[PDB]
DNA sequence: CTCGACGTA
DNA sequence: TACGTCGAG
């Protein structure tokens, strides 16, 4: 083992449950301080509860995939289907199953989405979105989403995909919304 | 026989308003109409003869022509990008035409920004955390990383993952936007 | 041309 | 299952 390689936890160590992908930050004769990726936790390991893995035979083709949240290398089935690509190939969501229940949250209620439903833009009507503010003809030009907030339940607003699953990529939480715009401002 | 709610194109220019601009029937008043024109967002008062209906349903994926989300100007495919491909294998173009995208686009990243951007670069299969999302990842295993930059200036940002990159884009590169995001979730929480 | 990723339908 | 969309590679 060197600094900078990959492992997998053999055995449950304290909080890291087995198959936990760590990378070794630093060896000695027969321990490992192994940053296990998934809790950020760094804890010295014997080199006998530790299993070398090889990263790049992992994900996309392979049996088995390293989920991008908690880090644990899982079987493929153990994420979701969500796309295919220009080979024909299926893609899973990054995130497994498990780590997916956090992000969805709690659904969109029927009560709630029937109260949208009584104010849905028509298809081919010509709908401005109230987030990035875009013309479009609904279902032509854009195509748009039920909204909803994933900690309540409750509906937000009818709103185009395009922003909906740009809301995912911030968590759909202000606090990384305004990071974005720091960021943004200090390269003015 | 233009009715409400229907949808045509201009057949030549009206004024501001360019061959193909697609517009949606306001009002009617004998033969003439009032049509919104999307792309522009003029409403304008038109003659029957100066409008060719069309079906919006057969235009875009499968069809010979397109309506662009921006210009609202209907093209021929050919001037949208082709971007990705569908479960089916069929090709998918950007909804945006290749003019709009040039606004979009913007500046490129200078050659000088790349060199410098790639001499800092994350190895692949090191542990990155994003700036922006703050989600740890192995480079190129369980999160891409690109070279974000300013399309105003052509001049390197930062390392970050795909998916906020991606995120960027959808508000535009602005702050404006993302402002508008915020108190749209504030209201909701 | 090709890419993954998001919350949706 | 699948979808379009984004800046990228
Ligand atoms: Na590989
Ligand atoms: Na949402
Ligand atoms: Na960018
Ligand atoms: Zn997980
Ligand atoms: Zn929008
Ligand atoms: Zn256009
Ligand atoms: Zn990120």
Known sequence: ???????IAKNQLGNIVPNSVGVIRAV???????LFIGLNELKRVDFSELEAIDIYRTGKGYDKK???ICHILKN?????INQTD???????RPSCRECRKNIDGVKLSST??????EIAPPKGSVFTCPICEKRSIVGVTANLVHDHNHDTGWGREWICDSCNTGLGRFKDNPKFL???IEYLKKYE
């Open 28 to 34: 000695n004769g027969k321990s490992a301080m192994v």
């Open 86 to 92: 220009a080979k024909g190939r299926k893609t899973t």
């Open 76 to 80: 493929t089935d153990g994420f979701e």
């Open 112 to 117: 709630e989405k029937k109260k949208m439903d």
């Open 178 to 180: 305004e990071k974005v």
């Open 1 to 7: 083992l060197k600094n900078d390689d990959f492992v």
């Open 66 to 68: 390293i989920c991008n």
